């Protein structure tokens, strides 16, 4: 029997004291994973924002580069 | 009376939490894999930014060198 059918048999045939402990155990597991899920989504928004700022900082540098390069090209007529 | 014949509620709770825990784990993993992808993207972009900085300095110093 796989671990899954063995667990299914446990739940449908174990005593209430066991069922109550599993309920408790899964409640801790779900609370912890919900905490980790939330921190992952915050991490994502933070790095998404850092990336956004970096993109603006980049495009800003692109404009400053073009201005200088534009001027230089003009100068090579002298 | 003997509503106490209630392991059917416990059993319902075990299965509810098991499913919620599975979806919360998918969402968590999915979230984490997206976080990694942004880090990868930001890394490529940081590399490109520092390239442009260098080239920017290259032609700020190559002009100014235009000196008369």
């Amino acid at each position: 029997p796989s671990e899954e059918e063995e667990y299914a048999r446990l739940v449908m045939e174990a005593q209430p004291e066991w069922l109550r402990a599993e309920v408790k155990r899964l409640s801790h597991e779900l609370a912890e994973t919900t905490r980790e899920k939330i921190q992952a989504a915050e991490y994502g928004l933070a790095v998404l924002e850092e990336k956004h700022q970096l993109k603006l900082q980049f495009e800003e540098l692109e404009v400053d580069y073009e201005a200088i390069r534009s001027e230089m090209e003009q100068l090579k007529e002298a | 009376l003997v509503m106490e014949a209630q392991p059917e509620w416990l059993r319902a709770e075990v299965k509810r939490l098991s499913h919620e825990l599975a979806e919360t784990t998918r969402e968590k993993i999915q979230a984490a894999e997206y976080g990694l992808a942004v880090l990868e993207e930001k890394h490529q972009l940081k590399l490109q930014f520092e390239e442009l900085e260098v080239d920017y300095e290259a032609i700020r110093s190559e002009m100014e060198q235009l000196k008369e």
């Binding site: 939330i38 989504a41 915050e42 998404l48 | 999915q30 979230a31 997206y34 942004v38």
Partner: peptide, 12 residues
């Protein structure tokens, strides 16, 4: 990338 931020907020 608005899809990522939407997914991220939907988890909060």
């Amino acid at each position: 990338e608005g899809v990522l931020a939407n997914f991220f907020n939907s988890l909060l």
